[PDB]
Amino acid sequence: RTGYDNREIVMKYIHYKLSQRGYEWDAGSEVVHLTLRQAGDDFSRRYRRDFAEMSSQLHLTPFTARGRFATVVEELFRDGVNWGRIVAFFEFGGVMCVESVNREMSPLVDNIALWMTEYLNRHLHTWIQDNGGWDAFVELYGP
Numbered sequence: 848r849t850g851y852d853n854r855e856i857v858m859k860y861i862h863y864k865l866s867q868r869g870y871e872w873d874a875g876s877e878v879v880h881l882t883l884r885q886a887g888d889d890f891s892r893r894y895r896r897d898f899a900e901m902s903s904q905l906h907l908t909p910f911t912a913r914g915r916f917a918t919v920v921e922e923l924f925r926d927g928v929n930w931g932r933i934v935a936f937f938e939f940g941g942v943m944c945v946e947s948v949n950r951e952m953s954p955l956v957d958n959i960a961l962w963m964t965e966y967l968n969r970h971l972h973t974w975i976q977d978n979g980g981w982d983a984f985v986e987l988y989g990p
């Protein structure tokens with residue numbers, strides 16, 4: 848119906864975060880993916896302390912990742928949604944994927960991509976559509 852699939856925004860974002868570390872191949876039209884990447888890179892520069900704390904406190908394992916993902920996301924959106932919190936959600940998913948590869952649990956990346964897609968589709972999609980859609984995010988933060 849929308850003409851797009853949020854799974855693609857998730858897959859492209861995770862691919863970019865892994866590629867930045869040399870964890871996935873990338874030699875280095877659509878504007879949403881570039882806008883989101885840039886916003887997330889800036890978010891992690893501004894909130895470097897929160898990023899470093901999140902990157903060392905996760906202690907991810909295959910049985911604990913699901914619960915940790917849900918708990919952090921619930922904390923993130925407890926006071927409501929805005930674009931910055933959506934950018935923070937992608938950055939959090941990125942940290943979970945990078946940590947999963949670091950801990951030799953690369954298959955978890957596919958599960959994290961599914962949980963992010965499901966949360967965007969079921970819990971954030973209404974807010975996004977009510978707030979001008981991805982079009983409004985690009986109008987505010989895009990080139």
Ligand SMILES: O=C(NS(=O)(=O)c1ccc(NC2CCOCC2)c([N+](=O)[O-])c1)c1ccc(N2CCN(CC3=C(c4ccc(Cl)cc4)CCOC3)CC2)cc1
Nearest residue numbers: 886889897898901922923929930931932934935938939988
């Ligand atoms: O300002 C905000 N929102 S905004 O006004 O919508 C807005 C403004 C400007 C711009 N972009 C800028 C425009 C000017 O040029 C440069 C770009 C955009 N944007 O979308 O691009 C949107 C805003 C600020 C901070 C914020 N977080 C919330 C999360 N928290 C830590 C935390 C968790 C957490 C910890 C680590 C990691 Cl990796 C992830 C999550 C998980 C558990 O919970 C706590 C840290 C602070 C949320 C929203």
